Design a protein around this ligand. Structure first.
Ligand SMILES: NC(=O)c1ccc[n+]([C@@H]2O[C@H](COP(=O)([O-])OP(=O)(O)OC[C@H]3O[C@@H](n4cnc5c(N)ncnc54)[C@H](O)[C@@H]3O)[C@@H](O)[C@H]2O)c1
Ligand SMILES: NC(=O)c1ccc[n+]([C@@H]2O[C@H](COP(=O)([O-])OP(=O)(O)OC[C@H]3O[C@@H](n4cnc5c(N)ncnc54)[C@H](O)[C@@H]3O)[C@@H](O)[C@H]2O)c1
Ligand SMILES: NC(=O)c1ccc[n+]([C@@H]2O[C@H](COP(=O)([O-])OP(=O)(O)OC[C@H]3O[C@@H](n4cnc5c(N)ncnc54)[C@H](O)[C@@H]3O)[C@@H](O)[C@H]2O)c1
Ligand SMILES: NC(=O)c1ccc[n+]([C@@H]2O[C@H](COP(=O)([O-])OP(=O)(O)OC[C@H]3O[C@@H](n4cnc5c(N)ncnc54)[C@H](O)[C@@H]3O)[C@@H](O)[C@H]2O)c1
Ligand SMILES: O=C(O)c1cccc(C(=O)O)n1
Ligand SMILES: O=C(O)c1cccc(C(=O)O)n1
Ligand SMILES: O=C(O)c1cccc(C(=O)O)n1
Ligand SMILES: O=C(O)c1cccc(C(=O)O)n1
Lengths: 266, 266, 266, 266
């Protein structure tokens, strides 16, 4: 058994992660955090995910619960997650990171410190999206060189980053397979006269609406046909269960930067 | 019978308009134009749309064919179309305009001169899209005030303007029905940290790929459900037949700014 | 204030209906039922939807809790619902019916006993679907007479009836608006050689998969274009909230067969 | 250089195949057929596809033009195609078959006579669909064993067979990859009470409407997420170009049953 701390436990993901750890018999919910100013600091973890009393309460700092946990699962905010990564380095803990929208500098620090700390990081903990990355590699080898490639993503009205880190990851899987760098081909907007579409651009279209848990579509378009590779997420539990399984997988592994692709054996 | 000049007859629309006039028994293809530098100036109208020889050839200026035609059908480029509108004013001709991406000034000139010239103008000559405008009005009255409204459009790789004039028209039909001005609520891009979506913004997402003749979706999204009103165009003839029918409708009508909504009786 | 009994309270809808009633301040959760053989007979209503203890428990027969409630909300199974309708007739209670897949004979008994009992019945308690019915009427009047009409629906793997009662209701709204009877035109399957599609047929395609809460699409297809009117349900609460509102509306009303359309004022 | 006879040259595919062969510089259009009762017997091939006069006319029987061609490309009707296959066997010709909806017995005769005659056969001549088959194999290996698999297809109102041979081929690629037989798991209809969905079933939903050139979607659905692999055909030329390429490839090859997968090197 692996003992889990859930960072930002009152969050959309947080609540689902507590639920998911609770439902996995090889993983124990041992700690949860929230922002110091949060009105749910002191509330029982179970009462906040409709599972009843767990006998564990929300603290404002995981440093106060170091002896309770092996792995932090972090789907919060980038600054918050880097602090937790430092905490892991300091106390020989491991971390599963789901937070998206890191800057390049922040991401370099993660790559650096993952030499010291066991880390799983991914923009998507669903099986389906990790399969999709693989499908996109095959599709890009066969159609990429002559087709227009467009990435369409839809999320709920509270998502702050655009496009999704998953959309960016799909972009990267396609460009990588074609021997290109995404930044060389990405277009993130179109307004007014754009002129004609270049042949090699990867267009990103971003939808923000309602309670959409997440839709991603990669389109490979020729004159006369197109292949669309689509993933639809209908429940956050699809991410939470994956994250918990990543945590379990991660336990007692040595330092390294691991992806959900590694975890799943893809 | 109404005699038709087709402006920019070698264009994607142009070719289809010739075909469509030829197939309509109450409308006669009498003239066609192309750019002075065009290598298809002098070619027979029929040989360029797979209908065989029509006995009519492409000229570089419709002023040289004034006695041949009653109505110009213009799906070309904004400067070109305004010249044709001036030609109509000068010689008592009528015009059906399908060209999109006019500036505000250009559009003001059209509104002004349509007091003198019989004009049909619309961003979409399909029946389906003109129905959709009406559906969007009803949907906005019932759901608009509490839902997130997003407009997604997809066109072929050669379209120069973004978003489509149809997407803009849908935006305008929705905002109009809610007593708002589109410019007050439209968002045409999302990149980086956007923060949370405002309640009243109308987001536009633009896809450019392959030979897509055109897909438009208006989404009204609540927490737990969404209504999507979608139009898919699969053949340019859907626009061309509408335009020709507009031309026929327009013949001998007095000066005015008429829409495809007027033409169809919606 | 209206007091609600939730039939089949451990069900997918049931749980949501308990939660929705409990959260709505103008309605009270007073009773819940389950099948006599059910292992959750005797469990508290609140522990069934992650809301903690309500001080109300699940009985195997609502006749034993008759003084506790005014309105039954019934999303269970057709035989079960007819028994609850009889209970209403016997004890002067009202009923909101969401159960689908009644036979014609069963439905006749509902119509008949709704002369005595205040009844709301609908295949869909979402606002969105009730708007869609109205949109379908407009679309059918404009495009129905010359276009192919197809209805596509997708639901979760546990749904027992096909097509959905909503799909059937859409079919009925369209055929009604065209002066036809659905049973005259519906086609529910296509296998082997069908030949060409007839002009008048309304095709129904049924998808069963995963945890899809429900997608319905009505398609109006011409040669070259099509209009698709789509509703996507992402959370059962979209139905539960509507049902509770129906219950509140229904309280103290006289006998009659009322729809969600009546309740919403559409 | 390979000389091509196009069976059923006035057909939807036929016309496109003539056009495609004529435009491809490594292949020649030499012969075309139509039904003996056909009013376009005697018409020039070129006037049938807007390419002007080819100096070749439509015969009612390809046996009369046997010295004109090497390869028949046959997208007609199953009985008609079997007659052309017999003609190939009799006169040492080769055949590219696109016709769909053969019975098992008919298909056995194809398999058998392909030991004598060079044959390409496939339900889809698009590159995209041939890639999709490969993607379906990967998706089935990763998600097939625990997810619901559904296949949705949409075609134009004139298609006589259901589901599409492509839909069936997708079903076969998935079942094959899972060590199952399609006929053991396929469900082609759902009406009335079906009960719950079985674990193993592959559901097929068939849409018939308008001028849809063809949409196929394979869905792999878990509780909380789904992967959809979609192909959309927008122009018949996507099939015609593939078929012509198949014909060029097939020229001078020995007897055998070859697929589009062989031709493309997938
Ligand atoms: N990788 C994936 O599979 C996946 C899935 C879903 C979401 N996400 C990503 O996860 C992140 C979180 O998304 P969300 O919708 O759950 O957001 P949210 O705002 O609903 O939840 C984040 C929570 O973290 C808390 N938090 C912030 N700073 C903190 C600190 N210093 N200590 C403790 N708690 C803190 C917040 O109070 C909040 O409750 C985003 O970056 C999002 O893109 C990733
Ligand atoms: N309203 C509708 O229903 C509808 C439908 C389709 C396209 N459109 C719009 O119609 C316009 C044309 O689209 P397209 O794809 O056909 O573009 P296109 O570039 O394929 O065709 C336009 C043609 O007009 C010609 N042209 C330009 N200037 C000219 C001049 N001075 N005289 C004569 N010919 C001239 C060009 O040479 C070209 O052949 C665009 O603005 C597009 O958005 C509208
Ligand atoms: N009208 C709508 O808006 C709408 C929305 C969702 C579902 N539905 C329909 O509602 C019905 C239920 O759907 P569901 O997914 O919740 O099914 P479910 O099987 O998850 O729930 C039904 C519940 O009713 C219970 N039940 C059956 N017979 C009973 C009896 N005699 N006494 C007490 N309880 C009994 C079952 O034990 C079960 O817990 C279906 O017909 C479905 O199509 C309608
Ligand atoms: N494999 C693929 O990629 C692919 C692609 C498109 C269509 N198809 C299939 O190809 C077939 C044809 O499709 P279509 O839409 O072109 O149909 P269609 O009816 O438009 O065309 C078929 C033509 O064959 C002709 N024909 C029939 N019997 C004949 C005979 N004995 N001699 C000469 N001509 C004859 C018909 O008169 C007709 O003109 C169908 O089975 C369809 O499913 C396959
Ligand atoms: O890749 C991402 O950015 C992502 C993935 C899943 C969910 C979310 C989210 O809800 O923000 N974001
Ligand atoms: O509204 C538009 O901009 C529009 C409508 C139909 C076709 C096109 C096009 O092909 O550009 N553009
Ligand atoms: O119309 C229907 O049949 C329907 C509507 C909403 C949900 C469900 C369901 O979950 O079965 N069924
Ligand atoms: O697999 C098929 O059945 C198929 C594939 C492409 C086109 C068509 C068609 O037009 O019928 N049918």
């Amino acid at each position: 058994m692996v003992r889990i701390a859930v960072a930002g436990a009152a969050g959309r993901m947080g609540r689902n992660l507590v639920k998911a750890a609770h439902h996995n018999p090889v993983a124990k919910v041992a700690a949860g955090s929230e922002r110091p100013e949060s009105s749910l600091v002191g509330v029982d973890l179970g009462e906040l995910c409709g599972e009843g009393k767990f006998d564990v309460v929300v603290c404002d700092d995981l440093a106060k619960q170091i002896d309770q946990f092996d792995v932090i699962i972090d789907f919060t905010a980038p600054a918050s997650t880097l602090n937790n990564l430092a905490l892991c380095q300091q106390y020989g803990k491991s971390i599963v990171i789901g937070t998206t929208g890191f800057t390049e500098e922040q991401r370099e620090q993660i790559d650096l410190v993952a030499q010291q700390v066991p880390v799983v990081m991914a923009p998507n903990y669903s099986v389906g999206v990790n399969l999709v990355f693989k499908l996109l590699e095959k599709a890009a080898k066969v159609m990429g060189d002559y087709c227009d490639i467009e990435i369409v993503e839809a999320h709920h009205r509270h998502k702050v980053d655009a496009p999704s880190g998953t959309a960016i990851g799909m972009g990267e899987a396609i460009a990588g397979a074609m021997g290109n760098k995404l930044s060389d081909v990405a277009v993130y907007a179109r307004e007014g006269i754009t002129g004609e579409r270049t042949k090699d651009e990867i267009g990103f279209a971003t939808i923000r609406a309602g309670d959409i848990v997440g839709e991603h579509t990669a389109m490979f378009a020729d004159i006369g046909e197109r292949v669309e590779i689509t993933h639809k997420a209908t429940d956050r539990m699809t991410f939470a269960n994956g994250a918990v399984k990543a945590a379990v997988w991660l336990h007692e592994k040595p330092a390294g930067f691991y992806t959900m692709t590694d975890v799943l054996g893809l």
